[PDB]
Amino acid sequence: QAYVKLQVAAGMANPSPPVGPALGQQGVNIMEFCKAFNAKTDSIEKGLPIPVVITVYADRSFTFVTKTPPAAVLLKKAAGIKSGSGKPNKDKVGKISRAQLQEIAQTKAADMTGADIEAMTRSIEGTARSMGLVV
Amino acid sequence: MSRYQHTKGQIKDNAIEALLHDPLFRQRVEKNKKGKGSYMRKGKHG
Amino acid sequence: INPVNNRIQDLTERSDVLRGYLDYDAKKERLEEVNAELEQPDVWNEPERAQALGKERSSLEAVVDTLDQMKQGLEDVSGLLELAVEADDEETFNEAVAELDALEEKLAQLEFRRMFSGEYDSADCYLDIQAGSGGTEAQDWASMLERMYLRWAESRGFKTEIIEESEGEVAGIKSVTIKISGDYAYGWLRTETGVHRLVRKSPFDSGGRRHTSFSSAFVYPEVDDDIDIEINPADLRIDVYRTSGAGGQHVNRTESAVRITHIPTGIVTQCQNDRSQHKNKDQAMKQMKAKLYELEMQKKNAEKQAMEDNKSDIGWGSQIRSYVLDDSRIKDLRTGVETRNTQAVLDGSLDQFIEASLKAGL
RNA sequence: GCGGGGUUGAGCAGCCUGGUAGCUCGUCGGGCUCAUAACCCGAAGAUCGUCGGUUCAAAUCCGGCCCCCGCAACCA
Ligand SMILES: [Mg+2]
Ligand SMILES: [Mg+2]
Ligand SMILES: [Mg+2]
Numbered sequence: 001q002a003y004v005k006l007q008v009a010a011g012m013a014n015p016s017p018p019v020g021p022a023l024g025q026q027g028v029n030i031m032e033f034c035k036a037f038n039a040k041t042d043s044i045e046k047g048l049p050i051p052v053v054i055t056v057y058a059d060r061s062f063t064f065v066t067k068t069p070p071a072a073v074l075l076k077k078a079a080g081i082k083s084g085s086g087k088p089n090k091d092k093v094g095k096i097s098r099a100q101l102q103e104i105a106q107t108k109a110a111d112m113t114g115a116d117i118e119a120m121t122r123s124i125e126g127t128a129r130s131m132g133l134v135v
Numbered sequence: 136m137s138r139y140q141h142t143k144g145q146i147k148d149n150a151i152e153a154l155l156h157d158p159l160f161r162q163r164v165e166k167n168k169k170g171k172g173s174y175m176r177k178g179k180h181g
Numbered sequence: 182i183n184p185v186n187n188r189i190q191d192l193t194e195r196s197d198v199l200r201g202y203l204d205y206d207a208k209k210e211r212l213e214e215v216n217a218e219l220e221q222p223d224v225w226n227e228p229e230r231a232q233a234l235g236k237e238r239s240s241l242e243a244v245v246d247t248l249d250q251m252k253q254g255l256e257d258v259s260g261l262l263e264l265a266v267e268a269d270d271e272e273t274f275n276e277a278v279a280e281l282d283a284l285e286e287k288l289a290q291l292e293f294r295r296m297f298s299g300e301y302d303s304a305d306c307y308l309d310i311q312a313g314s315g316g317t318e319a320q321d322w323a324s325m326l327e328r329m330y331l332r333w334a335e336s337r338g339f340k341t342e343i344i345e346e347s348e349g350e351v352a353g354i355k356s357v358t359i360k361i362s363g364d365y366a367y368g369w370l371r372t373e374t375g376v377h378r379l380v381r382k383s384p385f386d387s388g389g390r391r392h393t394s395f396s397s398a399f400v401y402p403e404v405d406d407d408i409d410i411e412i413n414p415a416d417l418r419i420d421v422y423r424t425s426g427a428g429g430q431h432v433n434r435t436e437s438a439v440r441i442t443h444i445p446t447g448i449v450t451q452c453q454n455d456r457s458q459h460k461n462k463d464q465a466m467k468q469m470k471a472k473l474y475e476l477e478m479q480k481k482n483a484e485k486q487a488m489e490d491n492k493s494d495i496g497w498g499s500q501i502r503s504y505v506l507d508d509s510r511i512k513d514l515r516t517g518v519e520t521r522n523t524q525a526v527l528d529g530s531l532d533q534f535i536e537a538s539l540k541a542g543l
Numbered sequence: 544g545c546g547g548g549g550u551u552g553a554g555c556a557g558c559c560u561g562g563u564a565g566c567u568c569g570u571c572g573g574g575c576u577c578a579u580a581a582c583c584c585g586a587a588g589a590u591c592g593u594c595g596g597u598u599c600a601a602a603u604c605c606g607g608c609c610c611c612c613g614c615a616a617c618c619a
């Protein structure tokens with residue numbers, strides 16, 4: 001019932017330019033969602049994007065559960081690099097160690113779909129590779 | 136801001152150049168206060 | 182750290198200058214309103230509008246954001262400068278320096294964008310200098326200007342080349358064309374297009390009077406001469422028919438004459454010079470080709486003429502600088518920057534004027 | 544289709560029986576003049592359209608290609 005993941009950084013309260021019409025497409029107001037996001041945020045950290053479920057009921061008071069922050073951003077943070085996608089195999093822009101990746105993995109274990117953290121780590125590595133960085 | 140009505144007619148190749156060969160950008164030489172073109176029959180207040 | 186400090190000091194000033202030229206507050210305001218509009222869901226029903234709006238916004242945002250960053254980065258550097266100095270922690274100092282460098286680079290990029298926005302701004306140019314109506318004095322002035330330009334170009338790094346030069350019979354040069362090769366040569370010089378106004382006591386005058394001579398500079402980019410592509414058989418309509426008068430039975434029967442026609446343009450070329458149809462066609466085809474070329478040239482001319490007319494409409498505003506050597510003050514009329522070191526300017530210190538002009542976008 | 548041509552920046556030579564780049568102007572540096580012109584002196588400057596060939600050797604002889612200039616392109 002109108003559930004879609006679509007939002008920018010957590011600290012930016014009330015995203016008017018990027019999301020705008022998308023969050024207030026259905027009957028739910030612009031104020032509420034933003035407020036909810038704000039409420040969510042203060043327990044952890046700002047700057048990073050965070051996705052959340054948007055089950056828009058007929059009553060309008062929607063139910064929601066947060067997800068872990070996206071992987072790509074985390075990877076970038078780990079790196080200390082901004083842009084590292086252009087021409088990956090032809091010339092290596094960035095590079096990361098496995099240990100770091102592993103460390104990164106373990107912190108998202110609640111939302112991550114797996115029991116063995118090894119699997120998670122390898123997924124993360126794969127993701128990193130896709131981006132452009134060689135492990 | 137009013138348009139300067141140049142004497143070149145229809146400008147074809149280059150406008151600035153045309154203007155330069157125009158009265159607007161004519162040479163101005165000052166009248167000498169002393170020297171050659173310097174004699175004044177009557178003063179400014181004469 | 183003295184050089185570093187100096188650099189830091191400079192950078193703030195530079196930023197301020199950029200802001201001034203940009204008209205930053207206005208831009209910010211625009212971004213705001215545009216953003217608001219975007220946020221409103223009714224805008225995306227009209228597709229053409231919406232995309233345009235989006236396009237508008239992003240650039241504005243970039244402009245603002247960059248400026249904001251510039252403000253902050255400098256401050257950070259300053260904060261860390263103290264650490265570098267008194268506390269004497271090396272790594273921290275290094276980091277600060279790095280940040281400054283990065284920030285500086287960013288600033289440069291924005292300013293570069295501002296300056297060299299045009300299509301041909303990257304290309305090499307032909308500086309054309311033409312002396313004014315005066316006579317000898319005017320010629321001399323022109324020559325001086327040329328010299329100055331040459332000095333500038335060399336300083337920059339550009340490769341100068343005197344393509345054509347008409348000399349003055351007494352002194353100075355009547356006219357001169359100079360090819361100025363190098364990266365962003367046109368974009369650097371395009372602002373110098375205009376009339377330049379010298380004021381000085383003439384050495385060639387026997388009276389020794391103060392003369393006010395003018396001389397034009399005109400910078401145009403080396404456009405690539407696009408090849409004249411041949412027309413298609415589909416675009417042409419080809420009649421063939423009998424010829425006028427002539428002599429015989431064979432002539433009466435045969436259809437040697439050829440009338441080629443352009444469907445897009447409505448131009449025609451006939452030919453019936455030759456007996457052979459084929460030859461006539463060839464001739465006719467050639468004629469048609471020639472005509473197309475002429476039409477393309479005509480079009481080019483007309484467009485140019487419009488531009489010229491437009492330029493003329495500015496009139497007295499084509500005068501961009503004023504070199505007063507009696508009272509020793511150079512003034513750029515459009516930007517308003519002044520300097521009393523006239524001689525220096527002449528020698529080729531135009532960066533102060535040029536840069537400002539670029540910033541302005543004039 | 545048949546001839547003639549492309550040579551310092553311009554206009555002309557040589558090519559005439561292969562090996563020598565000449566004339567007039569122009570350009571550049573000096574002079575004369577208050578200065579400029581004229582005048583005087585001294586210099587520089589040419590892969591001979593281009594590409595191949597024949598030669599010990601090519602502007603020069605032969606051919607191809609590009610461009611120019613003549614002519615001829617008829618008796619139905
Ligand atoms: Mg000749
Ligand atoms: Mg001989
Ligand atoms: Mg020889």
Ligand SMILES: [Mg+2]
Nearest residue numbers: 576579580581
């Ligand atoms: Mg003389």
